[PDB]
């Protein structure tokens, strides 16, 4: 029974992802997030190893939730008559990276480097587990303010990773790549790298570079804030119009702008506490 295992607190948010409540596991007072999704509102379905029909999101969370990482961990899930309920880790204290950037403005490059590095490691972990997130953005990144660790959330638009073309997409359009805008086709890794370029610009400039389809496909990156030449170069590489001109995850992490990253704890003590 879900009602007896978790004490339910206030609504944390709701939208296309469902309704998410703050919660506490009665067993050990572990903070949790309790996410409700209506079955009728579920587009992609999958099967666990046991062959139970579950939302794809449950399938993807199980694949990445083994061990520790910069990914939100699924602790449990339940099926109800008209919905699924997901029990997720809840960092405390926490702020999502969208609210963080709204309040602080453009991040210092030292802080954006540490955050972007951790997002890179989190996305590599998803890809190693066979999972493509497809909705990388600041809204889907939580900051553990005490530990200085970033956690990727919301796999409800993701898919199994594959090397063939995707022709479907339900993530965030202003982070989607020009090949999706023009042709409704993309490959998983190179589209992820585009969304990472958008995220990095967002971090160092205080907001995303593009709002309109014409800007996404136009291939022009105007920097509205002072950004180092090294960081500009990495961003423009991630945002190459041609997918095959974009860096691999290895080339990003070997980029000169990415060297000498802060540890998470150093990040918290210098920039968050």
């Amino acid at each position: 029974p879900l009602e007896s295992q978790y004490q339910v607190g206030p609504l944390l948010g709701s939208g296309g992802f469902g309704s998410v409540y703050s919660g506490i596991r009665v067993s050990d007072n572990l903070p949790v997030a309790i996410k409700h999704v209506e079955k009728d509102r579920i587009s992609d379905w999958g099967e666990l190893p046991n062959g139970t029909r579950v939302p794809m999101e449950v399938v993807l969370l199980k694949k990445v939730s083994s061990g520790f990482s910069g990914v939100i961990r699924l602790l449990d899930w339940f099926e109800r008559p008209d919905s699924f309920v997901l029990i997720l880790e809840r960092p405390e204290p926490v702020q999502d990276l969208f609210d963080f950037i709204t309040e602080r403005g453009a991040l210092q490059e030292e802080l954006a480097r540490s955050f972007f590095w951790q997002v890179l490691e989190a996305v590599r972990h998803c890809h190693n587990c066979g999972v493509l997130h497809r909705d990388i953005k600041d809204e889907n990144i939580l900051i553990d303010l005490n530990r200085g660790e970033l956690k990727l959330i919301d796999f409800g638009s993701g898919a199994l990773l594959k090397d063939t073309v995707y022709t479907d997409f339900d993530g965030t359009r202003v982070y989607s790549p020009p090949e999706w805008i023009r042709y409704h086709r993309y490959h998983g890794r190179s589209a992820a790298v585009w969304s990472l370029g958008i995220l990095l610009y967002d971090m160092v400039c205080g907001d995303i570079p593009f709002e309109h389809d014409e800007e996404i496909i136009g291939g022009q990156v105007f920097f509205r804030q002072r950004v180092s030449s090294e960081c500009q170069h990495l961003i423009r590489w991630c945002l190459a119009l041609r997918p095959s001109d974009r860096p691999t995850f290895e080339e990003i992490q070997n980029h000169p702008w990415m060297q000498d990253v802060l540890l998470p704890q150093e990040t918290a003590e210098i920039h968050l506490h």
């Binding site: 939208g15 296309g16 992802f17 969208f98 709204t102 909705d135 638009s157 339900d170 965030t172 907001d207």
Partner: peptide, 9 residues
């Protein structure tokens, strides 16, 4: 300049 969230979909 207006900064805003962008719902998925």
């Amino acid at each position: 300049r207006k900064r805003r969230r962008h719902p998925s979909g």
